[PDB]
Amino acid sequence: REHWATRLGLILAMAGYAVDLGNFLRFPVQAAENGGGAFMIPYIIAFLLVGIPLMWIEWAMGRYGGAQGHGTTPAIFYLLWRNRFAKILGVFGLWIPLVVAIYYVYIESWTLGFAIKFLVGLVPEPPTDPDSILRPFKEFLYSYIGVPKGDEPILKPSLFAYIVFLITMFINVSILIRGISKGIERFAKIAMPTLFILAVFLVIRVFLLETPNGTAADGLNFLWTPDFEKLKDPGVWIAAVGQIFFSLGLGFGAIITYASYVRKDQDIVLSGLTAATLNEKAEVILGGSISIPAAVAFFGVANAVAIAKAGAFNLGFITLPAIFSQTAGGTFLGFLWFFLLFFAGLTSSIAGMQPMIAFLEDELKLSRKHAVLWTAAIVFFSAHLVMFLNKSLDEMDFWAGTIGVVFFGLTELIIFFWIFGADKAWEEINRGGIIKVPRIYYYVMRYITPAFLAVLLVVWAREYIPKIMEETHWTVWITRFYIIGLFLFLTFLVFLAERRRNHE
């Protein structure tokens, strides 16, 4: 079995997985909308009661499975729980990262695409008033994706958008086809420092921004001034547990697969703790210091609330580019911003395709070359649904990327800590540990952690599921049809895997 070469590479690959577009866009907007500095109260709590416990569990499950030659959840769930229904539930840990990969690599390609257009100067140059600057960039983005100009839910990506998508797939395959240590690990050691340098340079330049409408301090102010009155709102605590769960990328099946390349007795308690921390530092220090302070510096604290309400996507793909076109050296600034996001995306997409590659390798005994190429093929082909059908992206992100991961997160806890056995699980987590998990966490993992996840799931099921089902366009059935098929197809592969094993 392949293994991580160095402890540092392992930590950087894992941190690379967690640190994504969300760190620099989603988190700052969530924080501004949910109590500013006060949001750190339920955020740290969520990190301690949900994020850290579950992450350790996923590392343990991954390492446990890897020792027996299995890096994915159909095989691993079966090992923790010998039942046919365990295998079926395990398919989700293969299906979720696959579906997310199907739209996420495309989004990732947008940033590479924007980075190049900025570098070579193929971007709008307004002219005045805020809308006079924002609109040409709104239009730039819309022409790239091919946002529908009519009533048809049809997208028309530019040739440039399409070729960059091809290039992006090529880069992913390039890394993945070289394997865990010589490919993913080697790349983490380059991308993670590069990421840090870009962010630090941006944080510095943002902190020097001064306009007639405000400064970076005004931005940092608005973001971090606490609003403790929002702590009463249940949705703020849900937001925190939600934010933590998603920032760490728990429930995607990715962490388990990566951990399966950790050796049987190699530490996971400290390594895991360090990786989660890197994500957090990247999130609150760097992520919170770039996008919101820059936006508020240019548009003024008066529009801060409006900016936060406009969302993470608009901030990163419309608002900030517009600001860069109005600032000195903003052309090279825009390149750095989108290059930064691209590496943030790239370190995450490789991790998210690895479970499929691992499954093809571990269970169907494919060579790495074939496993990577076929995985790329399924992802490349399927992505045409995301590129051409409007709102397809949102549908996949809801079922797989939102509802799915929380359900799968809860499923992992129960199978490992309740079915497999809390005591067997506890020893599994601490074995080889440079540090030992604090004894209090034995109760957290068994009762508190699943309780939190259950509450989150129910609130979200009650809140969002009725809306998506009753108020959406008929074309959503196209996306549902396709991803349900993917689940059927994966089930078949799991079926073929167990049959091959019975023969040999």
Ligand X SMILES: CCCCCCCCO[C@@H]1O[C@H](CO)[C@@H](O)[C@H](O)[C@H]1O
> By CB under 6 A, what part of segment 184-213 binds ligand X?
none
In this complex, which beta carbon is closest to ligand 29Q, that of residue 254 or of residue 413?
254
In this complex, which beta carbon is closest to ligand 29Q, that of residue 185 or of residue 397?
397
Q: Is 25 in the site for ligand X (CB under 6 A)?
A: yes
Report the residue number whose CB is nearest to ligand X. Answer: 162
Write b or e for each residue in 234-269: b if 16 or more Cβ atoms lie within 10 A of its Cβ, otherwise e. eebbbbbbbbbbbbbbbbbbbbbbbbbbbeeebbbb
Angle at 240 between CA 234 and CA 244, to 5 degrees: 150
Between CA 173 and CA 350 the distance in angstroms is 8
In this chain, which stretch among 46-54, 308-316, 409-417, 460-468 interacts with ligand X, using CB under 6 A? Answer: 308-316
Q: Is 224 in the site for ligand 29Q (CB under 6 A)?
A: no
End-to-end CA, the chain: 19
Helix, strand and coil in the chain, % to nearest 5:
80, 0, 20
What does 25 bind: Na ion, ligand 29Q, ligand X, none (CB cut-off 5 to 8 Å by kind)? ligand X
What residues contact 457, with CB distance under 8 A and at least 6 apart?
403, 406, 407, 410
Helices (H) and strands (E) in the chain, counts: 27, 2
In this complex, which beta carbon is closest to ligand X, that of residue 143 or of residue 181?
143
What residues contact 236, with CB distance under 8 A and at least 6 apart?
34, 35, 39, 42, 230
Residue 432 zone, left/alpha/beta (φ > 0; ψ -120 to 50; rest): left
> By CB under 5 A, what part of segment 322-351 binds Na ion?
344, 347-348
Structure tokens belonging to residue 37: 């500095």
> By CB under 6 A, what part of segment 333-352 binds ligand 29Q?
348-349, 352
In this complex, which beta carbon is closest to Na ion, that of residue 274 or of residue 475?
274
The alpha-carbon radius of gyration of the chain (Å, integer) is: 22
Residue selected from 101, 240, 295, 371 as contacting ligand 29Q according to rule CB under 6 A: 101
What is the nearest approach in angstroms of ligand X to the Cβ of residue 163?
8
In this chain, which stretch among 105-113, 190-198, 244-252, 496-504 interacts with Na ion, using CB under 5 A? Answer: 244-252
Q: Is 384 in the site for ligand X (CB under 6 A)?
A: yes
Q: Is 487 in the site for ligand 29Q (CB under 6 A)?
A: no
Angle at 339 between CA 338 and CA 343, to 5 degrees: 115
In this complex, which beta carbon is closest to Na ion, that of residue 77 or of residue 317?
317
In this complex, which beta carbon is closest to ligand X, that of residue 71 or of residue 334?
334
Between CA 26 and CA 141 the distance in angstroms is 19
In this chain, which stretch among 32-40, 84-92, 188-196, 312-320 interacts with ligand X, using CB under 6 A? Answer: 312-320
Structure tokens belonging to residue 253: 């099946």
Between CA 438 and CA 416 the distance in angstroms is 18
Q: Is 401 in the site for ligand 29Q (CB under 6 A)?
A: yes
Between CA 272 and CA 79 the distance in angstroms is 23
In this chain, which stretch among 14-22, 269-277, 303-311, 440-448 interacts with ligand 29Q, using CB under 6 A? Answer: 14-22
Between CA 231 and CA 242 the distance in angstroms is 15
Residue selected from 7, 116, 162, 374 as contacting ligand X according to rule CB under 6 A: 162
What is the nearest approach in angstroms of ligand X to the Cβ of residue 160?
8
What is the nearest approach in angstroms of Na ion to the Cβ of residue 341?
10
Between CA 272 and CA 255 the distance in angstroms is 10
Query: Closest by alpha carbon to 483, among 394, 408, 364?
Result: 394
- The pair phi, psi for residue 186, each rounded to 5°, is -55, -45
What is the nearest approach in angstroms of ligand 29Q to the Cβ of residue 310?
20
84 is in an annotated binding site: yes
Cα 309 to its chain centre, rounded Å, is 21
Q: Per-residue x/- marks for ligand X, 389-408, CB under 6 A?
A: -xx-xx--------------
In this complex, which beta carbon is closest to ligand 29Q, that of residue 325 or of residue 411?
411
Q: Is 64 in the site for ligand 29Q (CB under 6 A)?
A: no
What does 104 bind: Na ion, ligand X, ligand 29Q, none (CB cut-off 5 to 8 Å by kind)? ligand 29Q
Amino acid code (one letter) for 486: L
In this complex, which beta carbon is closest to ligand 29Q, that of residue 154 or of residue 459?
459
Structure tokens belonging to residue 482: 């396709």
Query: Closest by alpha carbon to 222, among 280, 284, 293, 291?
Result: 293
In this complex, which beta carbon is closest to ligand X, that of residue 21 or of residue 202?
21
What does 347 bind: Na ion, ligand X, ligand 29Q, none (CB cut-off 5 to 8 Å by kind)? Na ion
Question: Which residue is associated with the tokens 């819309």?
Answer: 142
Q: Which residues are annotated as a binding site for phosphocholine?
A: 84
Q: Rule CB under 6 A: which residues touch ligand 29Q?
A: 17-18, 20, 97, 100-101, 104, 246, 249, 252, 254, 348-349, 352, 401
Q: Rule CB under 5 A: which residues touch Na ion?
A: 16, 18-20, 23, 247, 279, 344, 347-348
Q: Rule CB under 6 A: which residues touch ligand X?
A: 21-22, 25-26, 107, 145, 147, 156-159, 162, 312-313, 316, 384, 390-391, 393-394
